[PDB]
Subunit: 104 residues, 2 copies
Protein backbone atom coordinates (compact mmCIF):
# COMPACT_ATOMS: atom_id res chain seq x y z
CA UNK A 1 0.00 0.00 0.00
CA UNK A 2 1.69 3.19 -1.14
CA UNK A 3 0.72 6.79 -0.37
CA UNK A 4 1.70 10.04 -2.11
CA UNK A 5 1.32 13.20 -0.01
CA UNK A 6 1.11 16.35 -2.13
CA UNK A 7 0.37 19.97 -1.32
CA UNK A 8 -1.69 22.59 -3.14
CA UNK A 9 -3.86 25.65 -2.58
CA UNK A 10 -7.41 24.58 -1.89
CA UNK A 11 -9.88 25.48 -4.68
CA UNK A 12 -7.19 26.42 -7.16
CA UNK A 13 -6.17 24.19 -10.09
CA UNK A 14 -3.38 21.74 -9.32
CA UNK A 15 -1.49 19.57 -11.80
CA UNK A 16 -1.09 16.38 -9.79
CA UNK A 17 2.43 14.98 -9.61
CA UNK A 18 2.23 11.59 -11.36
CA UNK A 19 3.29 8.95 -8.79
CA UNK A 20 3.68 6.31 -11.57
CA UNK A 21 6.71 5.76 -13.80
CA UNK A 22 6.26 8.51 -16.35
CA UNK A 23 7.19 6.64 -19.54
CA UNK A 24 4.58 3.95 -18.98
CA UNK A 25 0.87 3.85 -18.19
CA UNK A 26 -1.38 5.30 -15.51
CA UNK A 27 -5.11 5.57 -14.89
CA UNK A 28 -6.76 7.90 -12.34
CA UNK A 29 -9.75 6.80 -10.26
CA UNK A 30 -11.89 7.78 -7.34
CA UNK A 31 -12.50 4.91 -4.91
CA UNK A 32 -16.00 5.55 -3.57
CA UNK A 33 -15.88 6.30 0.16
CA UNK A 34 -12.22 5.18 0.14
CA UNK A 35 -13.68 1.68 0.64
CA UNK A 36 -12.01 -1.11 -1.30
CA UNK A 37 -15.32 -3.03 -1.49
CA UNK A 38 -16.96 0.00 -3.16
CA UNK A 39 -16.70 1.00 -6.85
CA UNK A 40 -13.58 2.35 -8.52
CA UNK A 41 -14.60 5.19 -10.86
CA UNK A 42 -12.38 6.15 -13.78
CA UNK A 43 -11.96 9.91 -13.94
CA UNK A 44 -10.91 10.13 -17.59
CA UNK A 45 -12.35 8.53 -20.72
CA UNK A 46 -11.15 8.29 -24.32
CA UNK A 47 -13.22 10.13 -26.93
CA UNK A 48 -11.20 11.13 -30.04
CA UNK A 49 -7.73 9.75 -29.37
CA UNK A 50 -7.77 12.04 -26.34
CA UNK A 51 -8.71 11.77 -22.67
CA UNK A 52 -11.47 13.94 -21.25
CA UNK A 53 -13.14 14.12 -17.83
CA UNK A 54 -16.05 11.78 -17.23
CA UNK A 55 -19.46 13.37 -17.61
CA UNK A 56 -21.89 10.56 -16.74
CA UNK A 57 -21.07 10.52 -13.00
CA UNK A 58 -21.28 13.87 -11.22
CA UNK A 59 -18.25 14.49 -9.07
CA UNK A 60 -18.63 18.24 -9.16
CA UNK A 61 -15.91 20.76 -9.86
CA UNK A 62 -13.11 18.27 -9.26
CA UNK A 63 -11.30 17.28 -12.48
CA UNK A 64 -10.11 20.24 -14.53
CA UNK A 65 -8.29 18.29 -17.25
CA UNK A 66 -7.06 14.83 -18.15
CA UNK A 67 -4.13 16.10 -20.27
CA UNK A 68 -2.39 16.36 -18.01
CA UNK A 69 -4.45 15.20 -15.04
CA UNK A 70 -5.39 18.39 -13.19
CA UNK A 71 -7.76 18.83 -10.27
CA UNK A 72 -9.23 21.70 -8.36
CA UNK A 73 -7.21 21.27 -5.19
CA UNK A 74 -9.59 19.56 -2.75
CA UNK A 75 -10.20 16.13 -1.31
CA UNK A 76 -12.93 14.58 -3.49
CA UNK A 77 -16.17 14.30 -1.56
CA UNK A 78 -17.03 11.00 -3.26
CA UNK A 79 -13.95 9.10 -2.08
CA UNK A 80 -10.20 8.67 -2.37
CA UNK A 81 -7.98 9.64 -5.30
CA UNK A 82 -6.11 6.57 -6.61
CA UNK A 83 -3.76 6.12 -9.56
CA UNK A 84 -3.09 2.71 -11.07
CA UNK A 85 0.43 2.27 -12.49
CA UNK A 86 1.37 -0.34 -15.09
CA UNK A 87 4.22 -1.00 -17.49
CA UNK A 88 1.79 -2.50 -19.98
CA UNK A 89 -1.34 -1.37 -21.79
CA UNK A 90 -3.14 -4.55 -20.68
CA UNK A 91 -2.85 -3.38 -17.03
CA UNK A 92 -2.79 -7.05 -15.98
CA UNK A 93 -0.05 -6.41 -13.41
CA UNK A 94 0.10 -3.07 -11.63
CA UNK A 95 0.27 -1.28 -8.32
CA UNK A 96 -1.90 1.52 -6.93
CA UNK A 97 -0.91 4.74 -5.19
CA UNK A 98 -3.32 6.77 -3.12
CA UNK A 99 -2.86 10.54 -3.40
CA UNK A 100 -3.64 12.68 -0.37
CA UNK A 101 -3.46 16.49 -0.15
CA UNK A 102 -2.21 18.92 2.47
CA UNK A 103 -3.57 22.43 1.88
CA UNK A 104 -1.01 25.23 1.68
CA UNK B 1 6.00 15.26 3.59
CA UNK B 2 4.95 11.67 4.13
CA UNK B 3 1.79 9.64 4.43
CA UNK B 4 1.22 6.07 5.52
CA UNK B 5 -1.63 4.16 3.88
CA UNK B 6 -3.26 1.49 6.04
CA UNK B 7 -6.43 -0.61 5.77
CA UNK B 8 -9.08 -1.54 8.30
CA UNK B 9 -12.79 -2.28 8.63
CA UNK B 10 -14.58 1.01 9.19
CA UNK B 11 -15.87 1.66 12.72
CA UNK B 12 -14.14 -1.38 14.22
CA UNK B 13 -10.91 -1.50 16.26
CA UNK B 14 -7.62 -1.30 14.39
CA UNK B 15 -4.10 -1.59 15.84
CA UNK B 16 -2.22 1.04 13.84
CA UNK B 17 1.00 -0.01 12.14
CA UNK B 18 4.06 1.96 13.27
CA UNK B 19 4.79 4.48 10.45
CA UNK B 20 8.18 5.32 12.00
CA UNK B 21 11.58 3.68 11.51
CA UNK B 22 12.51 0.86 13.87
CA UNK B 23 13.65 2.14 17.29
CA UNK B 24 12.17 5.62 16.74
CA UNK B 25 9.82 7.00 19.35
CA UNK B 26 6.32 7.80 18.12
CA UNK B 27 3.64 10.15 19.43
CA UNK B 28 0.10 10.26 18.08
CA UNK B 29 -2.05 13.25 17.23
CA UNK B 30 -5.20 14.40 15.52
CA UNK B 31 -4.44 17.37 13.30
CA UNK B 32 -6.76 20.37 13.68
CA UNK B 33 -8.03 20.77 10.14
CA UNK B 34 -6.25 20.26 6.84
CA UNK B 35 -3.16 22.52 6.73
CA UNK B 36 0.32 21.11 7.30
CA UNK B 37 1.11 23.91 9.77
CA UNK B 38 -2.02 23.20 11.81
CA UNK B 39 -1.80 22.55 15.56
CA UNK B 40 -2.01 18.96 16.74
CA UNK B 41 -4.02 17.44 19.56
CA UNK B 42 -1.93 14.79 21.26
CA UNK B 43 -3.61 11.47 21.98
CA UNK B 44 -2.86 9.02 24.78
CA UNK B 45 -0.28 11.48 26.26
CA UNK B 46 -11.79 7.33 18.47
CA UNK B 47 -9.01 5.94 20.72
CA UNK B 48 -9.57 2.30 21.66
CA UNK B 49 -6.26 1.61 23.42
CA UNK B 50 -3.00 3.42 24.02
CA UNK B 51 -0.85 0.28 24.28
CA UNK B 52 -0.62 -0.78 21.64
CA UNK B 53 -2.14 2.29 19.97
CA UNK B 54 -5.51 1.12 18.68
CA UNK B 55 -8.18 3.25 16.99
CA UNK B 56 -11.74 2.90 15.86
CA UNK B 57 -11.14 2.61 12.13
CA UNK B 58 -12.35 5.95 10.76
CA UNK B 59 -11.16 9.34 9.65
CA UNK B 60 -11.41 11.72 12.62
CA UNK B 61 -13.84 14.50 11.90
CA UNK B 62 -11.35 17.14 13.08
CA UNK B 63 -8.54 16.04 10.78
CA UNK B 64 -6.02 13.33 10.02
CA UNK B 65 -4.24 11.00 12.38
CA UNK B 66 -0.62 12.18 12.43
CA UNK B 67 2.31 10.33 13.97
CA UNK B 68 5.44 12.22 15.03
CA UNK B 69 8.63 10.12 14.73
CA UNK B 70 11.78 10.97 16.69
CA UNK B 71 15.02 9.13 17.30
CA UNK B 72 15.71 10.98 20.54
CA UNK B 73 13.33 11.05 23.45
CA UNK B 74 13.37 14.86 23.46
CA UNK B 75 11.53 15.06 20.08
CA UNK B 76 13.57 18.14 18.97
CA UNK B 77 14.43 16.60 15.58
CA UNK B 78 11.37 14.81 14.23
CA UNK B 79 9.28 14.07 11.17
CA UNK B 80 5.50 13.73 10.95
CA UNK B 81 3.61 11.10 8.97
CA UNK B 82 -0.07 11.44 8.11
CA UNK B 83 -1.96 8.14 8.44
CA UNK B 84 -4.53 7.60 5.70
CA UNK B 85 -7.12 4.81 5.88
CA UNK B 86 -8.53 2.61 3.17
CA UNK B 87 -11.66 0.85 4.37
CA UNK B 88 -12.08 -2.84 3.73
NA1 LIG C 1 6.66 9.50 -11.39
NA1 LIG D 1 -8.78 11.54 0.77
NA1 LIG E 1 -6.68 -5.08 -17.08
NA1 LIG F 1 7.81 13.78 7.02
Amino acid sequence: QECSLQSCTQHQPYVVDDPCPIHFYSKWYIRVGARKSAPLIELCVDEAGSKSPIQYIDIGNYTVSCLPFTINCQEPKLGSLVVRCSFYEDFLEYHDVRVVLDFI
